[PDB]
Amino acid sequence: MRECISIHVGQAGVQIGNACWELYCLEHGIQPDGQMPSDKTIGGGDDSFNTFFSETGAGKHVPRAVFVDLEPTVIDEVRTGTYRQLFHPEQLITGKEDAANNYARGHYTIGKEIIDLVLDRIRKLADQCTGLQGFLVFHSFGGGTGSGFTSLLMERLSVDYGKKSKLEFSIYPAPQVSTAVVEPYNSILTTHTTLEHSDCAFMVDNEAIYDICRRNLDIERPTYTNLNRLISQIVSSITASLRFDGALNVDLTEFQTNLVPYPRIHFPLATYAPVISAEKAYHEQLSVAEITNACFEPANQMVKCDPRHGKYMACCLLYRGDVVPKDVNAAIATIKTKRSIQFVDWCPTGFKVGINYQPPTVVPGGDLAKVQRAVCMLSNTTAIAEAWARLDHKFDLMYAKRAFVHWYVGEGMEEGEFSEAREDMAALEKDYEEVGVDSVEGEGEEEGEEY
Amino acid sequence: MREIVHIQAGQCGNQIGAKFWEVISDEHGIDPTGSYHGDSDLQLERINVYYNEATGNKYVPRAILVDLEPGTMDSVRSGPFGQIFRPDNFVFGQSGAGNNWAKGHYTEGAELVDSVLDVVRKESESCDCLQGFQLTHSLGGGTGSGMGTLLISKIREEYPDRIMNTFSVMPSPKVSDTVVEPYNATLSVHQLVENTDETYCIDNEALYDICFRTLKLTTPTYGDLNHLVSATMSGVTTCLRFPGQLNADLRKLAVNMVPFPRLHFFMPGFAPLTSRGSQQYRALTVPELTQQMFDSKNMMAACDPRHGRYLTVAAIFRGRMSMKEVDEQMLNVQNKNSSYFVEWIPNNVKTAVCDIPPRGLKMSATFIGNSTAIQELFKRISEQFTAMFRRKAFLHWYTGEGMDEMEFTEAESNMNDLVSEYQQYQDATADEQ
């Protein structure tokens, strides 16, 4: 009916995929082995929702996903894990060496020798769908595979399919902490394909999520599992409108129509308001106004950037649970009166709204409290440029002396591509500065004459 | 499937290899007879990295043992793990080099190198997808330095895309067990600078210092030093064998650690070390591991890292731990000691985490540092080498085997350039002139 393929590339993509599919199976009542006894108990229903799962004759459901990597280590955990029977055996590993934090080994040399098989599997999966909505690629900047192979795959998909949407959920490098020394080269080289081919890319930062976990959930020593669970909640709130009934429904194309003003500024931030532990779930009302206010707090952003240093071009709110429209209108009206939050003068409306009835679920063994209301906010703003500028500086400090460059050219990339891109990133930074400027005073010269 | 071929030449390399295979066999639960008697399931998942499968569920390692005297082969065969190795890989001759580099690389080794290369090719062709090689040896001796450099040269010529490693025991400043050591160390470093992707520098003096001070041993012996080095060797390649939350192959360490092709001399380290009878006082946590790991007195290179600057650092953790703690601790180490890190690399600490810790340690970590202080070692060797070369101390033993004096000079020049290149990225500012 309304199908979406999820493509996971790299260790970060595969692990976020594990979290996402755990959440989906818990949400629709599918056992880890693919069976759904709840339908047999009910005697018939549409629980086998076609947004994510495909049904066979025997009642087994297979997800619509394509996992990709170059290290067998990550996928072999899944092939012998709890969900070994859920997925199709076609997991698409390259039983060879990894790209090894080298964008080149993942777009020019080892990146081939696996792209054709991936595209064939995607072709089969897409043929199974009877009217597709779009794609959801999960990857991570910095990694060699998640940069190079993501770029190659997006190029081929854009050639083959063209008109279908393509969304990203990516882990941008943090301002301070990182787990690699050659990260900036990979990020800058990736930005071109992130820009030209993708239709709407969301970014998150591990440092911000660590701070959120420390402050809200009182977890002093979080690990990647908690971050992955949070990102999974975000994606579920994004896609909830396709699956469950609601008063106001928002399709994937409505996000794009309402959220991107111009083709080159499709980089919004995401936020999730009621992140609260079970112990603190009491002592609080968690009304609609409270969560709407919390969504705009600068401390709750999932990217280390201050919204107060820029302007909000557009916003989109997706509500889940026991929510009524009048409270939503009251909250939006309250937000519009504050002076700390600034809106560009050429978007007087600046709000999109969606309401869904199904409340969020709770993962057993998780750390999020059970709540009646929730909201996910997607904001297209100009603050994000600041983050790019920081990373930009780091790039220069390594490219003046040509550090770590012989590895990249040893695999098939002319020293030129490095600068040909830096320039592309600089052009993008120029546009964000240009769009946020207020319209020039009385933009059409001067008026006032005879009548 | 990432297969590693292991080679070892000379007395020192043979002894270290024996201890290393005993350690790895314990890790994967292989009996001395070669059968598997382990408990967990993950041990057989990646056994093919280091072992080949025989008929009756028996495993045999990929060791290749080389020497020019049969004494050490006899010692290794008559040992606790003598029968695990393949008999056809024991390559040896007679009338060894005798601390003479020329005998090892130009005269005697030229006869055995063909057989050794034949065995290496036979072992390598059977692998599914070879990743790299290894070589344990000592530079102060004849057979080790000579045959090791010759093997490295030939193998690098034959297989040019794979990763070559080496664990070399450098000559020490003070403790000396040979007199003609500097010639062998120099004429060798000349080849190691060219034909290797990573070299880890070991020194007896640092290991003795660790045993006397940290472990508090009263009678250290060579078994202990081999133990330390073997622990480090096992720690380096962990992510190929066991799963984890952030993997790092040999090639990733190669890419992240080396800024320029000729700067690949590393200082290794391992934590923790409770010295026994003091475990109950020391609480084992990630900050404690990071504290002990960066200490100047824990290194095995006999160089003070405080006299230079860290070009790059890598930390591989093994255990169950939180990633926030690791990232925060590395950031704190970088900030608090900002004087000792180069300024034109914005972040210079690679991190990796593996899930399966060693036999009886809740947590462990291994360290691979790359700093300019290592130059001191080369400088010291030069300060000896020329002192013996101005008056031609022991030269006739070398020229008698066919080696023109020019070869000696072409090398003192190469190592001196290495010291100069490291000295460039050492000053903590560069402006004005």
Added chain:
Amino acid sequence: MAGASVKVAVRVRPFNSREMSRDSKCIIQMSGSTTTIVNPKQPKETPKSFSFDYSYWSHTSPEDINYASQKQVYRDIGEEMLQHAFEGYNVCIFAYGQTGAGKSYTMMGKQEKDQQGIIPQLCEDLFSRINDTTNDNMSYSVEVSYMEIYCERVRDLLNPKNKGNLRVREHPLLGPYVEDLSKLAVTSYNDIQDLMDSGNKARTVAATNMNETSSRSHAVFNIIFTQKRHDAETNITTEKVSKISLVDLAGSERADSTGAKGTRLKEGANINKSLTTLGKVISALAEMDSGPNKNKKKKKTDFILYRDSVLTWLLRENLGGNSRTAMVAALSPADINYDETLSTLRYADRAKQIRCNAVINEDPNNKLIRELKDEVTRLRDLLYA
């Protein structure tokens, strides 16, 4: 020692038969010391632009104005560098380009021997100047050698033996050199032509998508030049010795262009590594030249680093020391071959990058209106005064 005065030159060739057959378009435009190039697929945003110390327009063959004639480029480079050579210091020429751009041409010239490249003009002036200058109280000696660098291995061309690898060495006083490298004496430029043709027949070449014949290795043609004096005394001595290194660089490579696997990618990777090292050393030499010239405080020794690749290692005497360097980069005029020209300009932009900019003029009607208003203002002044 002498200042590392590096000369950056670029030259555009005309159309070939295939390009003329197609309805191709010229994209390089020059003005002063700046060259600009456009995209056929992206004609909206802007042209890219570069600046070099010399820009040479050999596009239009019958053109009479601002034509970069071969005698002109020889006067620009070869005459001054031969003058430097006769002072006893080393000289190096680097030829760079991609199949088509027009490298060989600039190095050799046409076959009818009517318009001569750098090599014939330099060699004939060297020979002729000497033949019309030598006397009883002087002697001159000239020798030639020819080698190639392939996969970081040195191979000989003049010697017809089995092409085994040779071994680089480092004589303590004379610097790097190669054992068993054939060296021959020459008398006139016909001998150099014979040896050059014989060596060029032995070079390794492979076919690719771009061209059926593409250089897979660098080449070095060394001319050893020695002057000996016979003073009015029993002590007869060599005044000084100088070397001329004419060097052919293989073009930069991209799998996005040569899709071959196996040995072909490996050769391209090694070529790119060598090119990067060469650019790294060359730019550092220019910085070394520039620093003390500006502030008088030489930057210590910035100890340049050559022991990184065999190409820069063998040529240590020619880049460094008392020597001069000059580089010419060929560019092709097809609108189809965009990114080849872009990469060539980008890699040529190194080695004392020159500041480049654009100009852009204004609507002609507005300029005419402004001129008329200025004239009216002057006349109103012609009225006021």
